[PDB]
């Protein structure tokens, strides 16, 4: 913040909220817990200007739990190989993919 | 297919924004934003929020009904204005349309649209979670900590709207 | 960045437990005070690996242990759970307070067959200790080395020398 | 910017166009001096009508005091330039 | 960012453009001030409800509260300027700087 | 520096109020009646309405 | 309207520029903008005149806007990071759309034209707060995102405001408009030595608020909103020609007076970044300032303009204004060069 | 005193609903300070088990802790089935 | 599917019966028919003239009194949390709001319709 | 006569949950085993579909860590039947 008066008489006003790996209702798990916590232990005193060069590899994972954009497109690409295939009648799907 | 069912609200959600944001009469601009207001429950309450669906709806509904009574009063003209009465409104409506029209044809034939950012076309459904919740509802949980949790929350938006009262006393008194 | 390793179709199979939610719920109660030790020690490693492919061996004793309780059932008493599991499978709700009746029957024969007892409210959600010889992990989360901390300015502090030095201040 | 000054020239083509517009008045036979009575046969409702052309041309009102002594385009003319003091 | 989040940012993108564009009518314009409203809600919950961001499930609810005081105040103004003017045209508001 | 488009400009009033606009809107005028089940058959009650 | 109101309705535009300051929370600092708003319009359809309601129009529609803006940057920030703490944004698009958003608050060209409007539009005492309160908030949030902000952006917004600032303040004869302009050329300094030293950014504002009450207050204290009116100064109260006259010339930036302060801390920074044609650029355009300036002081201190016959019956009368810290702050706003080096308390 | 009870009396002959009002809000704030079974109304709910117990790892020095649920350790509901 | 297969039952029916009124019976068109209804005289003025709001101020305060239920519905579940001290002192402090809130407008003549 | 109720449908609660978290192990043990068979048969079937791509590795994961990352919807039900897709996307959602 720009005046820290949370820090200085130790009350959480809205620090509870900021990170979904925080304290949540009845222990409720966020989907990216586990790479959000990895991201935020990394990068913890270091700085922004270290993080951003040292704590890529972290921050690389938890946005691709986020967004998901590397997963789609491999499913993309799979899903296209395989229309191509049917399509000329090459590839037999099997049993359980289609029922 | 029933596997696109979110998209096509969200097409029907994008066509009642160019409703409003055509801009005729407010009485067809409030009717536009009870449609989007409408599939905008829909969406929200696909991705597994029921309360949040049903309380924007409901929320909306009561303000075009006050708009509606304010548009009579405040906002008429003799000959109200419909879609198809202005070229400028129409032309809104169509380059709207048209618009909404290239980008659902590219992102369903592509399955990939790059605007601003990176988008995907393999189904609103892929990214979904796998694993079933306990005995409850997640946004019923996260909701009713706002009375536990967010007390600061409480705090701020409750003086808003105490705030909110005295204000609109003071704009309108006039003389 | 690397394959993702996966059992095989030999090492997932296992006899698996077929009956209803009905039956389930019908003795979940007796089926959590007698399959208990095998079935915590499963959850203990679930929530310590943090890995399904880790746990597979324990997994299958939860199947097993689940299996032998229900035989147990079909030897001494099969016929009045036979007749509890339905009451409750009638309910929508699967409710236990609309078969109440049925369920004292249940009970008793399992007491006098086979010893057993229903646990008391509030038994099952207590957090019990599971001894396990299973090693406790390090680094389950796969967590790299961190970064090394900036080096922390040490000393006494000591007056700027010749005040700001800003232009010509001489303070 | 603003609007082109009112001039003496200007002011007589507009009433010479109004009238020539009313569908009484012979284009022909109509002067800047003509009398409305005697020369183009109008009656007085007639002139009239002229007059509240005048008011609709220019935009300002006429009373019936001064209405009355305009009986030819000229006067009409003079009245106008009189009342937005285009003296020219 | 699946397809869905293409058209729920295409409508913000079109109520953007129709709160810069204001034709006559003030009413006109707040209700596109309302439209923008309703997106951001949707996109918000779109991505906390996808990702169990649990207490995150509240700012939804806080955002609607904030977004009704904007438009009640946006009613108050309309209704003096309608009271001077006898219509809610932006043109009458021409008397600052002009 | 006077211009071609700030020719029309006027200086602000003094105190910052403008004039009020002279009558802009009138009431809203209403047919009351004949056919009216409270205007007893034969009453053309015209009314003039602000709400 | 009743004072016990008054006061909660000032309370509540501080307490929503408060929150701005102490959240670590973008939906707080949202809600801190929210608040901040509501309270505003009120003060400034105090009057209830139709230039008061437009003011209060345009005041709305372009700080709405502007935080539709700043919440969609937070979306955007959340779905790209997951968090909502008030640090660098982790979007270029989100960087885009809250440094526009908060330009659009601060009156930044070319989001400017509401500045000269509204300024003019509402009394002196709610311009004082438009013009200088209402700058804390927005400066607070671009002081702690200042490293994901696109430099060709920020600094293209400061020579614009700079120039439109100093261009547009020539035309002016109404105080409340040259104000105004003035606020618009002083915020491109501030965010023009934003990348490279915030601290000089917050001396720089704190500088131009002093200086800017100071020019308000003693606008409030005979009541004048015009040149001309000003200009009967000097046969009612002649001190505060001097006053004014010193005033007008610190905010013009020459030595040895205060206003030179920020102007002359600004450019060393900028320079220990090898940044030489920005910073020359910036200092001889800001004579277009100093010139406006100084037909103020020709017509209220330096020449003597003709009066009125009813002047007279002001003379036995007493100023009952308040004008609190005006004698504090005429001293601080000309007289503070000598104590420079203080500029490290706020680091 | 005698004037205390001519306001009252005023404002239940002028306004009798809005004297039931803030009696029943003045007693929703006051009881629960004062009422003894504010205590138990959160002893039930911590006791509602929405998650999973999920077992500690036995080290051998945790006595307190049941090995088995129907063990005499640990948290007892034997005060909610009396309630 | 379920509710959409309702829905679209519901409406379909009453589009039904609709498009019945209007073919099935014969028809008589004229333009006195047809006339807007004021009584048997011809309305002066359009119908979409300016109809002034009398309860206007109200009318906004609905706004702001109709964003209570949805911070005050979430109140059966708030109820079920281990903080009930504090749930319960914020669930209060809200409620007392909207009442000082409706205090203030009541006292101040807000909820007069002006005349 | 309400609060005695309530009591009881609390105590009913606490039963009825215990009986979930009896069973919770064995419905644990059973996804775990029914994810990983479903992640292989994608596998296979990813082996006999992009033999021919070239720059393919069958089975890559998308992440730098080695983690167990749990599958997403389209991760497990990529290649199957759209009726079965359905329902696991939004059967829940749709049961009324
Ligand atoms: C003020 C700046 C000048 C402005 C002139 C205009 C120019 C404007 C452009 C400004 C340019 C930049 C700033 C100026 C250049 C300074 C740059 C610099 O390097 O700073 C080094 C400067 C000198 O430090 P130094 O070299 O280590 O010590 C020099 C000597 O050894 C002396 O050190 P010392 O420790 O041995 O003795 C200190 C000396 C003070 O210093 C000096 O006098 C000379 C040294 C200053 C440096 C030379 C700067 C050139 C200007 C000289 C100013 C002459 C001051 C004398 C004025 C006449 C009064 C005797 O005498 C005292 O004051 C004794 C202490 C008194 C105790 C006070 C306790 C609190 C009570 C307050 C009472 C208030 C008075 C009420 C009056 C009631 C009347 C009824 O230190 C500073 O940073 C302070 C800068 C400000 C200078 C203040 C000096 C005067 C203080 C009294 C105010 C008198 C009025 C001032 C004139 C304004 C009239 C309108
Ligand atoms: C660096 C530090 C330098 C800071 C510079 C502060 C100096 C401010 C200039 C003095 C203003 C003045 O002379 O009063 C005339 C003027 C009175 O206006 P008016 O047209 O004569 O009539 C007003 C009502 O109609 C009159 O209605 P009424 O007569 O029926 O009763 C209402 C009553 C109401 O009385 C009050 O003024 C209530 C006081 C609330 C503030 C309480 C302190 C905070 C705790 O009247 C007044 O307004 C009293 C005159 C104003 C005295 C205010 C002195 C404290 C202000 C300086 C501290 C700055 C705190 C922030 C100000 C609020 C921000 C929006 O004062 C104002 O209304 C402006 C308020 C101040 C806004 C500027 C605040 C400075 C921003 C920089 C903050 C630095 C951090
Ligand atoms: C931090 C602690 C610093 C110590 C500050 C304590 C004194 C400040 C408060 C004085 C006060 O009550 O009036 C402030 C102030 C009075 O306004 P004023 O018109 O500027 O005072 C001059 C009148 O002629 C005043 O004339 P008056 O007839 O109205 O009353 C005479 C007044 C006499 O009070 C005074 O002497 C006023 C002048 C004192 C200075 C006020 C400005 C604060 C200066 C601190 C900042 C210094 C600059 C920072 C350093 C920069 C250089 C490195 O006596 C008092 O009120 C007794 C105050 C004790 C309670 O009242 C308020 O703003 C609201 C309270
Ligand atoms: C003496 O001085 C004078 C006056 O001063 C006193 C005057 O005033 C006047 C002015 C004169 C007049 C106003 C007319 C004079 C004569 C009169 C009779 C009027 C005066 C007074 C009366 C009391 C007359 C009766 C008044 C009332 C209010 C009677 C109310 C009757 C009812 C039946 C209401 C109760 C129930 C119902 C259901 C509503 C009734 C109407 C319906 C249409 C109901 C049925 C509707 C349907 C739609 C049926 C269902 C249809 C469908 C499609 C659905 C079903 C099918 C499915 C598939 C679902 C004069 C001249 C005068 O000289
Ligand atoms: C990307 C596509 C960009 C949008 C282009 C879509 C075309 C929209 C123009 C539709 C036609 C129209 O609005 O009128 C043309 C307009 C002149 O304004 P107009 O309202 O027609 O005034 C004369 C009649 N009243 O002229 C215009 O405003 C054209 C603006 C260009
Ligand atoms: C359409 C098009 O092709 O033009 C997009 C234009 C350029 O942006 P871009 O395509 O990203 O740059 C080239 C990278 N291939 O970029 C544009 O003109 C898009 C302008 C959209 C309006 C932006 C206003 C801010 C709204 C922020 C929400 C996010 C906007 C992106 C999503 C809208 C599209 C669905
Ligand atoms: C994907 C990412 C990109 C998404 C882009 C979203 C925008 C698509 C268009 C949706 C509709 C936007 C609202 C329409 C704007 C509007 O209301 O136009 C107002 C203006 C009114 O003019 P008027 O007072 O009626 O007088 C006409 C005299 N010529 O009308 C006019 O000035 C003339 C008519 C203009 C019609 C075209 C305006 C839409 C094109 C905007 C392109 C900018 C992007
Ligand atoms: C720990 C926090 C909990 C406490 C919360 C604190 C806030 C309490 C108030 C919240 C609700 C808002 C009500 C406050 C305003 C009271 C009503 C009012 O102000 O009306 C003013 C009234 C004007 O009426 P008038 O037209 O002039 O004619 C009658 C002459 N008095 O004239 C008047 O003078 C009003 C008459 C006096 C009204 C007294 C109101 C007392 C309210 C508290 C009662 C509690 C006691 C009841 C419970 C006892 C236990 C059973
Ligand atoms: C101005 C109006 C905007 C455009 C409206 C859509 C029609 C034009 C699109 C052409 C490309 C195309 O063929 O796209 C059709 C798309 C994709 O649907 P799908 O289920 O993937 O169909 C294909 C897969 N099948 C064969 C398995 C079913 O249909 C939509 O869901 C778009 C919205 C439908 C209209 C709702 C608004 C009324």
Redesign the interface.
Same mark, same amino acid.
């Given at each position: 913040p720009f005046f820290d008066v949370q820090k200085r008489l130790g009350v959480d006003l809205d620090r509870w909220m900021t990170i979904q790996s925080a304290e949540q209702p009845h222990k409720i798990p966020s989907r990216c817990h586990a790479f959000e916590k990895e991201w935020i232990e990394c990068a913890h005193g270091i700085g922004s200007i270290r993080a951003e060069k040292e704590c890529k590899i972290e921050f690389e994972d938890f946005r691709e739990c986020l967004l998901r954009q590397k997963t789609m497109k491999r499913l993309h690409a799979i899903r296209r190989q395989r229309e191509k295939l049917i399509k000329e009648g090459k590839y037999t799907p099997p049993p359980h993919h289609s029922g | 297919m029933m596997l696109y069912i979110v998209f096509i609200l969200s097409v029907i959600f994008v066509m009642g924004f160019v409703g409003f944001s055509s801009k005729p009469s407010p009485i067809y601009g409030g009717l536009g934003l009870i449609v989007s207001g409408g599939v905008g429950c829909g969406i929200v309450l696909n991705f597994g929020g029921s309360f949040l669906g049903l309380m924007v709806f409901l929320i909306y509904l009561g303000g075009m009904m006050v708009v509606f009574g304010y548009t009579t009063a405040m906002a008429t003209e003799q000959y109200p204005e419909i879609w198809l009465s202005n070229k400028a409104v129409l032309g809104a409506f169509v380059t709207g349309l048209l618009m909404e029209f290239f980008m659902v044809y590219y992102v369903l034939k592509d399955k990939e649209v790059e605007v601003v950012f990176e988008f995907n076309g393999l189904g609103d459904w892929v990214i979904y979670d796998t694993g079933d919740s306990g005995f409850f509802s997640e946004e019923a949980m996260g909701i009713a900590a706002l009375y536990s949790y967010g007390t600061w929350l409480v705090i701020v938006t409750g003086w808003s709207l105490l705030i909110g009262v005295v204000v609109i006393m003071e704009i309108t008194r006039g003389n | 960045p690397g394959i993702v390793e996966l059992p095989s179709l030999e090492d997932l199979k296992v006899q698996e437990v077929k009956v209803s939610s009905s039956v389930l719920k019908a003795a979940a109660h007796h089926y959590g005070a007698q399959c208990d030790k095998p079935n915590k020690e499963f959850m203990l490693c679930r929530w310590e690996e943090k890995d399904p492919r880790r746990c597979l061996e324990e997994g299958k004793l939860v199947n097993q242990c689940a299996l032998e309780f229900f035989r147990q059932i079909k030897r001494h008493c099969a016929e009045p759970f036979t007749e509890y599991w339905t009451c409750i499978d009638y309910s929508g709700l699967q409710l236990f307070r609309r078969c109440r009746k049925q369920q004292a029957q249940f009970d008793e024969c399992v007491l006098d067959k086979l010893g057993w007892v229903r646990p008391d409210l509030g038994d099952l959600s207590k957090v019990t200790k599971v001894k396990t010889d299973r090693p406790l992990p390090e680094n389950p989360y796969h967590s790299r080395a961190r970064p090394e901390p900036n080096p922390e300015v040490e000393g006494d502090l000591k007056p700027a020398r010749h005040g700001s030095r800003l232009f010509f201040w001489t303070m | 910017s603003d609007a082109p000054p009112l001039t003496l020239e200007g002011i007589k083509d507009r009433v010479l166009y109004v009238l020539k517009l009313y569908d009484k008045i012979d284009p022909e036979k109509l002067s800047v001096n003509s009398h409305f009575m005697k020369d183009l046969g109008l009656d007085s409702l007639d002139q009239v009508e002229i007059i509240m052309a005048m008011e609709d041309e220019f935009g300002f009102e006429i009373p019936d005091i001064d209405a009355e002594k305009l009986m030819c385009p000229q006067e009409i003319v003079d009245y106008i330039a009189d009342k937005k003091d285009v003296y020219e | 960012? !699946?397809? $869905?989040?293409?058209?729920?940012? *295409? /409508?913000?993108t079109?109520?953007?453009? &129709?709160?810069?564009?204001?034709?006559s009518?003030? *009413?006109? !314009?707040?209700?596109?001030? @309302?439209?923008?409203?309703?997106?951001?809600? $949707?996109?918000? /919950?779109?991505?906390? %409800?996808? !990702?169990?961001?649990? %207490?995150?499930? *509240?700012?939804?609810?806080?955002?609607? $509260?904030?977004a009704?005081? @904007? /438009? /009640?105040? &946006?009613?108050?103004?309309?209704? *003096?300027?309608?009271?001077?003017? &006898?219509?809610?045209y932006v043109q009458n508001?021409n008397?600052?700087?002009? | 520096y006077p211009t071609k488009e700030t020719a029309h400009w006027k200086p602000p009033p003094w105190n910052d109020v403008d004039p009020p606009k002279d009558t802009l809107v009138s009431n809203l005028t209403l047919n009351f009646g004949p056919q009216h089940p409270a205007a007893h058959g034969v009453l053309r009650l015209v009314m003039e309405l602000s709400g | 309207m009743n004072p016990i109101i008054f006061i909660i309705i000032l309370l509540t535009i501080m307490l929503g520029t408060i929150i701005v300051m102490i959240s670590s929370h973008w939906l707080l600092v949202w809600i801190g903008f929210e608040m901040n708003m509501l309270a505003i319009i009120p003060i400034m359809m105090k009057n209830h005149n139709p230039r008061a309601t437009e003011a209060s129009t345009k005041y709305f529609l372009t700080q709405s806007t502007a935080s539709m803006l700043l919440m969609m940057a937070v979306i955007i920030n959340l779905m790209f990071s997951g968090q909502w703490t008030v640090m660098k944004l982790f979007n270029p698009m989100a960087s885009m759309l809250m440094t526009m958003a908060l330009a659009m608050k601060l009156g930044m060209a070319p989001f400017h034209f509401w500045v000269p409007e509204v300024t003019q539009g509402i009394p002196l005492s709610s311009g004082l707060i438009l013009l200088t309160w209402q700058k804390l908030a927005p400066m607070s949030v671009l002081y702690q995102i200042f490293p994901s902000i696109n430099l060709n952006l920020i600094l293209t917004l400061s020579v614009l405001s700079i120039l439109i600032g100093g261009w547009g303040g020539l035309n002016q004869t109404q105080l409340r408009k040259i104000m105004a302009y003035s606020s618009i050329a002083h915020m491109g300094w501030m965010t023009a030595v934003l990348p490279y030293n915030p601290t000089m950014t917050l001396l720089n504002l704190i500088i131009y608020i002093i200086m800017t009450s100071t020019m308000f207050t003693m606008f409030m204290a005979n009541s004048t909103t015009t040149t001309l009116s000003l200009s009967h100064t000097w046969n009612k109260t002649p001190i505060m020609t001097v006053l004014i006259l010193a005033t007008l010339l610190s905010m013009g930036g020459l030595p040895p007076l205060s206003g030179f302060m920020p102007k002359w801390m600004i450019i060393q920074e900028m320079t220990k970044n090898n940044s030489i044609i920005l910073p020359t650029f910036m200092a001889i355009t800001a004579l277009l300032n100093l010139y406006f300036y100084m037909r103020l002081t020709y017509s209220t201190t330096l020449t003597m303009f003709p009066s009125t016959n009813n002047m007279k019956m002001k003379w036995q009368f007493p100023l009952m204004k308040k004008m609190t810290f005006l004698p504090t702050m005429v001293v601080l706003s000309t007289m503070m060069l000598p104590l420079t080096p203080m500029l490290s308390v706020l680091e | 005193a005698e004037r205390v009870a001519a306001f009252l009396k005023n404002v239940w002959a002028k306004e009798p609903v809005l004297v039931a009002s803030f009696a029943i809000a003045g007693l929703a704030v006051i009881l629960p300070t004062l009422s003894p079974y504010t205590k138990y109304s959160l002893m039930i709910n911590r006791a509602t088990p929405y998650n999973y117990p999920v077992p500690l790892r036995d080290d051998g020095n945790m006595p307190d802790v049941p090995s088995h649920p129907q063990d005499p350790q640990g948290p007892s509901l034997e005060w909610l089935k009396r309630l | 599917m379920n509710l959409m297969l309702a829905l679209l039952t519901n409406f379909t029916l009453a589009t039904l019966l609709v498009i019945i009124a209007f073919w099935l019976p014969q028809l008589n068109v004229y333009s006195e028919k047809t006339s807007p209804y004021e009584c048997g005289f011809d309305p002066m003025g359009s119908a979409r003239l300016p109809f002034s709001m009398k309860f206007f101020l109200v009318a906004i305060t609905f706004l702001l009194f109709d964003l209570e239920i949805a911070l005050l519905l979430p109140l059966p579940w708030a109820s079920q949390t281990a903080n009930l001290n504090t749930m319960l002192t914020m669930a209060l402090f809200l409620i007392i709001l909207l009442a000082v809130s409706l205090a203030y407008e009541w006292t101040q003549k807000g909820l007069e319709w002006t005349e | 006569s309400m609060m005695k109720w309530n009591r009881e449908r609390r105590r009913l609660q606490i039963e009825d949950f215990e009986a979930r978290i009896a069973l919770m192990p064995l419905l644990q043990a059973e996804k775990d085993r029914r994810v990983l068979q479903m992640l292989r048969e994608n596998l296979e079937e990813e082996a006999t579909v992009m033999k021919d791509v070239p720059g393919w590795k069958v089975g890559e994961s998308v992440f730098h860590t080695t983690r167990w990352v749990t599958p997403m919807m389209g991760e497990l039900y990529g290649l199957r039947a759209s009726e079965e897709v359905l329902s696991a996307t939004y059967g829940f959602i749709w049961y009324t």
């Open positions: - | - | - | - | 960012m !699946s397809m $869905v989040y293409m058209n729920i940012m *295409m /409508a913000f079109v109520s953007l453009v &129709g709160l810069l564009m204001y034709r009518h003030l *009413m006109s !314009s707040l209700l596109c001030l @309302e439209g923008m409203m309703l997106s951001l809600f $949707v996109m918000a /919950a779109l991505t906390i %409800l996808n !990702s169990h961001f649990t %207490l995150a499930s *509240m700012m939804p609810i806080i955002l609607l $509260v904030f009704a005081c @904007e /438009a /009640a105040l &946006g009613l108050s103004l309309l209704v *003096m300027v309608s009271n001077t003017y &006898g219509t809610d508001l008397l600052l700087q002009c | - | - | - | - | -």
